[PDB]
Each structure stands twice: as structure tokens, then as C-alpha cells.
Amino acid sequence: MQYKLILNGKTLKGETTTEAVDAATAEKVFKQYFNDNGVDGEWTYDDATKTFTVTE
Amino acid sequence: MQYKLILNGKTLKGETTTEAVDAATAEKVFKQYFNDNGVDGEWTYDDATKTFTVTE
């Protein structure tokens, strides 16, 4: 279903939102992006509350 | 001064905001990001209205 990206950091802050096929994909996609980008913030995943938490 | 990033696309949509030293830098930075991230959306720059326009 619809997932939501929460961004926490210093050089960047904000919230994105995407809908993937499911838990395994949205998760797969947003990871693809925030695993580096000089942020590699702390990862968090929420399935049943559609959320992500990135923390530099 | 304060610049603003407008995101237009399919896999991603949203708005970010950063303050750079000036027109040459904010421009330089946001370009650094949206020139490939599978989006490489159309570029647009606004100095006097602090804005950017990305379009897949």
C-alpha cells in the first residue's frame, strides 16, 4: 500500500511518499536511496503504519 | 538566500528547501542530486523567486 518517508538529518530534512507493490518493495526502494547520500541515516521501517525513518 | 526544490515525477513527488551561499551554489547543489537518480527530470532554475523545478 502507500508508504511514507520521514527524513531526519542536518543537510536534509523532509517527507516523501510512494506506493510500492508491498512491504518488501517500498522498503526495497527507499533503502536503495537512503543507504548512502552522505546521510546513510538510521533506518527504521513501519509496515502497518506506512512509515520510514531516516536519521543521519 | 533560501532556495526551494519542487519535485515533479512518478516514482517520486515532493518539495525540499535549502539555503546556499547564492544562486551559483544552491543551483550547484540541487543539481548534484537530480541529474540522474533514475529521474534526471527536466531542469529549471529560479533565482529571484527561489525555486527549482524537476520533471522526470
JSON list of C-alpha atoms in Angstrom, two decimals, chain B:
[
{"chain": "B", "resi": 1, "resn": "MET", "atom": "CA", "xyz": [19.33, 33.17, 0.03]},
{"chain": "B", "resi": 2, "resn": "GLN", "atom": "CA", "xyz": [16.74, 30.48, 0.70]},
{"chain": "B", "resi": 3, "resn": "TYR", "atom": "CA", "xyz": [16.02, 28.35, -2.37]},
{"chain": "B", "resi": 4, "resn": "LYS", "atom": "CA", "xyz": [13.19, 25.82, -2.86]},
{"chain": "B", "resi": 5, "resn": "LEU", "atom": "CA", "xyz": [13.15, 22.43, -4.61]},
{"chain": "B", "resi": 6, "resn": "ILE", "atom": "CA", "xyz": [9.95, 21.43, -6.43]},
{"chain": "B", "resi": 7, "resn": "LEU", "atom": "CA", "xyz": [9.80, 17.76, -7.37]},
{"chain": "B", "resi": 8, "resn": "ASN", "atom": "CA", "xyz": [7.74, 16.51, -10.32]},
{"chain": "B", "resi": 9, "resn": "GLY", "atom": "CA", "xyz": [7.72, 12.88, -11.33]},
{"chain": "B", "resi": 10, "resn": "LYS", "atom": "CA", "xyz": [6.04, 9.48, -10.97]},
{"chain": "B", "resi": 11, "resn": "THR", "atom": "CA", "xyz": [8.25, 7.39, -8.67]},
{"chain": "B", "resi": 12, "resn": "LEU", "atom": "CA", "xyz": [8.82, 10.47, -6.52]},
{"chain": "B", "resi": 13, "resn": "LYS", "atom": "CA", "xyz": [7.00, 13.70, -5.67]},
{"chain": "B", "resi": 14, "resn": "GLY", "atom": "CA", "xyz": [7.64, 16.36, -3.02]},
{"chain": "B", "resi": 15, "resn": "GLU", "atom": "CA", "xyz": [9.32, 19.66, -2.10]},
{"chain": "B", "resi": 16, "resn": "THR", "atom": "CA", "xyz": [12.68, 20.27, -0.35]},
{"chain": "B", "resi": 17, "resn": "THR", "atom": "CA", "xyz": [14.22, 23.59, 0.74]},
{"chain": "B", "resi": 18, "resn": "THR", "atom": "CA", "xyz": [17.86, 24.61, 1.31]},
{"chain": "B", "resi": 19, "resn": "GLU", "atom": "CA", "xyz": [19.80, 27.83, 1.73]},
{"chain": "B", "resi": 20, "resn": "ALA", "atom": "CA", "xyz": [23.06, 28.09, -0.15]},
{"chain": "B", "resi": 21, "resn": "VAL", "atom": "CA", "xyz": [25.65, 30.78, -0.37]},
{"chain": "B", "resi": 22, "resn": "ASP", "atom": "CA", "xyz": [23.91, 32.07, -3.51]},
{"chain": "B", "resi": 23, "resn": "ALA", "atom": "CA", "xyz": [22.42, 31.44, -6.96]},
{"chain": "B", "resi": 24, "resn": "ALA", "atom": "CA", "xyz": [25.55, 29.62, -8.18]},
{"chain": "B", "resi": 25, "resn": "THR", "atom": "CA", "xyz": [25.70, 27.22, -5.19]},
{"chain": "B", "resi": 26, "resn": "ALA", "atom": "CA", "xyz": [22.11, 26.19, -4.38]},
{"chain": "B", "resi": 27, "resn": "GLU", "atom": "CA", "xyz": [21.90, 25.66, -8.07]},
{"chain": "B", "resi": 28, "resn": "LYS", "atom": "CA", "xyz": [25.12, 23.68, -7.94]},
{"chain": "B", "resi": 29, "resn": "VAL", "atom": "CA", "xyz": [23.92, 21.55, -5.00]},
{"chain": "B", "resi": 30, "resn": "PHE", "atom": "CA", "xyz": [20.39, 20.61, -6.06]},
{"chain": "B", "resi": 31, "resn": "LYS", "atom": "CA", "xyz": [21.89, 19.76, -9.49]},
{"chain": "B", "resi": 32, "resn": "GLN", "atom": "CA", "xyz": [24.33, 17.44, -7.81]},
{"chain": "B", "resi": 33, "resn": "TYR", "atom": "CA", "xyz": [21.28, 15.37, -6.72]},
{"chain": "B", "resi": 34, "resn": "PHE", "atom": "CA", "xyz": [18.65, 15.50, -9.51]},
{"chain": "B", "resi": 35, "resn": "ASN", "atom": "CA", "xyz": [20.77, 14.87, -12.58]},
{"chain": "B", "resi": 36, "resn": "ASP", "atom": "CA", "xyz": [20.35, 11.02, -12.53]},
{"chain": "B", "resi": 37, "resn": "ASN", "atom": "CA", "xyz": [18.58, 9.34, -9.51]},
{"chain": "B", "resi": 38, "resn": "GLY", "atom": "CA", "xyz": [16.69, 7.41, -12.25]},
{"chain": "B", "resi": 39, "resn": "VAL", "atom": "CA", "xyz": [14.65, 10.65, -12.62]},
{"chain": "B", "resi": 40, "resn": "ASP", "atom": "CA", "xyz": [17.03, 13.18, -14.25]},
{"chain": "B", "resi": 41, "resn": "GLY", "atom": "CA", "xyz": [13.85, 15.22, -14.57]},
{"chain": "B", "resi": 42, "resn": "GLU", "atom": "CA", "xyz": [13.77, 18.41, -16.62]},
{"chain": "B", "resi": 43, "resn": "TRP", "atom": "CA", "xyz": [15.70, 21.21, -15.00]},
{"chain": "B", "resi": 44, "resn": "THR", "atom": "CA", "xyz": [14.52, 24.64, -14.22]},
{"chain": "B", "resi": 45, "resn": "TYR", "atom": "CA", "xyz": [16.11, 27.32, -12.04]},
{"chain": "B", "resi": 46, "resn": "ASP", "atom": "CA", "xyz": [14.62, 30.43, -10.47]},
{"chain": "B", "resi": 47, "resn": "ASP", "atom": "CA", "xyz": [16.88, 32.87, -8.65]},
{"chain": "B", "resi": 48, "resn": "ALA", "atom": "CA", "xyz": [14.58, 35.82, -7.85]},
{"chain": "B", "resi": 49, "resn": "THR", "atom": "CA", "xyz": [11.69, 33.57, -6.90]},
{"chain": "B", "resi": 50, "resn": "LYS", "atom": "CA", "xyz": [13.80, 30.96, -5.09]},
{"chain": "B", "resi": 51, "resn": "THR", "atom": "CA", "xyz": [12.73, 27.87, -6.92]},
{"chain": "B", "resi": 52, "resn": "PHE", "atom": "CA", "xyz": [13.73, 24.72, -8.76]},
{"chain": "B", "resi": 53, "resn": "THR", "atom": "CA", "xyz": [11.62, 22.51, -10.98]},
{"chain": "B", "resi": 54, "resn": "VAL", "atom": "CA", "xyz": [12.44, 18.87, -11.52]},
{"chain": "B", "resi": 55, "resn": "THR", "atom": "CA", "xyz": [10.41, 16.90, -14.07]},
{"chain": "B", "resi": 56, "resn": "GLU", "atom": "CA", "xyz": [11.10, 13.19, -14.70]}
]
